[PDB]
């Protein structure tokens with residue numbers, strides 16, 4: 001049991017891939033966010049969503065699929 | 067710990083961390099997982115965030131005490 | 134004249150919560166992330182406690198063992214506005230309790246839900262639920278929310294701490 | 301009830317912005333951004349304080365109003381005396397819904413109501429409102 005579980009959710013419709021999802025510092029102060037270009041629930045609506053903590057803070061539409 | 071190991075998000079509802087040849091820290095998920103990320107998310111040097119093929123999010127924090 | 138150990142993760146508010154407990158004059162001004170260790174004193178109503186300010190950074194957490202012996206109480210600050218590391222705080226509490234020293238000594242323990250001001254924070258009952266304050270039954274604990282800038286909430290905390298260390 | 305005035309700022313425990321809302325009956329309520337259960341343990345006390353205060357007040361008021369009810373009932377038998385009536389306010393609003401063809405009458409009283417008669421002189425349909433919790437008795 002080496003992997004301490006933190007959060008398990010199922011309503012977050014996050015259909016990203018292993019390459020369009022990256023975490024880094026985005027406002028300094030040593031608080032890393034995670035930015036992901038998420039597709040539509042099917043792949044119709046490209047939406048950029050960033051995650052801080054485990055609550056969604058900003059999702060905004062994107063021209064085309066990242 | 068200088069551990070730089072490749073992961074694997076298998077379709078049988080599990081994820082197994084792979085070093086050169088050995089398996090370790092294999093985990094389970096309620097559904098097969100399509101994307102995994104390991105880094106300093108939040109404020110922990112050992113965060114791993116994983117997204118289910120059906121949606122949802124699973125965030126796991128690795129303890130530092132690894133006839 | 135009692136030795137107390139203040140505990141908290143990285144950037145959880147330890148230096149600023151022991152700083153706001155110092156008197157008016159001797160109170161410092163600037164707070165910086167700490168390194169290694171230090172010594173600090175603060176006067177309660179009827180007693181005077183001493184803490185060892187120590188960095189809550191990951192690789193600088195083992196040192197917490199050194200001071201387990203002299204401790205008579207445990208102050209445990211937790212960023213109530215930090216929903217991610219809550220499980221890390223739970224595990225740190227668990228691995229601090231079951232230590233051979235503190236597993237049975239029956240010492241009072243006060244948890245500080247720091248940053249009560251932020252709008253991304255939890256109430257005391259919620260953080261108590263998510264922190265498993267029930268898995269302990271050998272020590273009388275107490276969790277209190279307190280923003281460590283306006284100085285509100287620390288007084289009643291140390292008051293309960295002393296009124297429990299006496300009785 | 302019916303809100304009659306709204307303001308921002310802070311009135312309690314400075315350092316947390318809140319909304320002050322004046323209620324029709326007079327209950328000047330606030331909506332704060334600060335948690336309420338800020339402390340707990342193995343087992344708040346302000347609930348107990350407010351409970352005790354309301355206890356004492358209701359005891360003494362019951363004493364006074366019971367004695368006054370006795371005096372009023374025993375003095376009601378006085379022949380020449382007259383029994384005056386407590387006046388009160390009913391903020392009614394006989395508007396006309398445009399999306400439908402149905403007026404929506406709305407009575408309000410500072411206290412709570414016991415029963416409302418609806419007598420008419422016109423063939424009228426009294427429909428049902430989900431928000432209403434009253435019973436009907438045609």
Ligand SMILES: Nc1nc2c(ncn2[C@@H]2O[C@H](COP(=O)(O)OP(=O)(O)OP(=O)(O)O)[C@@H](O)[C@H]2O)c(=O)[nH]1
Pocket residue numbers: 141142143144145146147148149150164165166167186187188189190247248249250251279280281282283
């Ligand atoms: N808004 C707000 N910020 C706070 C509060 N308490 C602390 N902070 C901020 O976050 C920090 C809290 O103190 P910390 O620096 O975490 O205390 P510390 O002992 O140095 O913590 P470590 O560096 O992990 O050892 C300070 O730098 C303040 O900027 C609080 O109650 N409210």
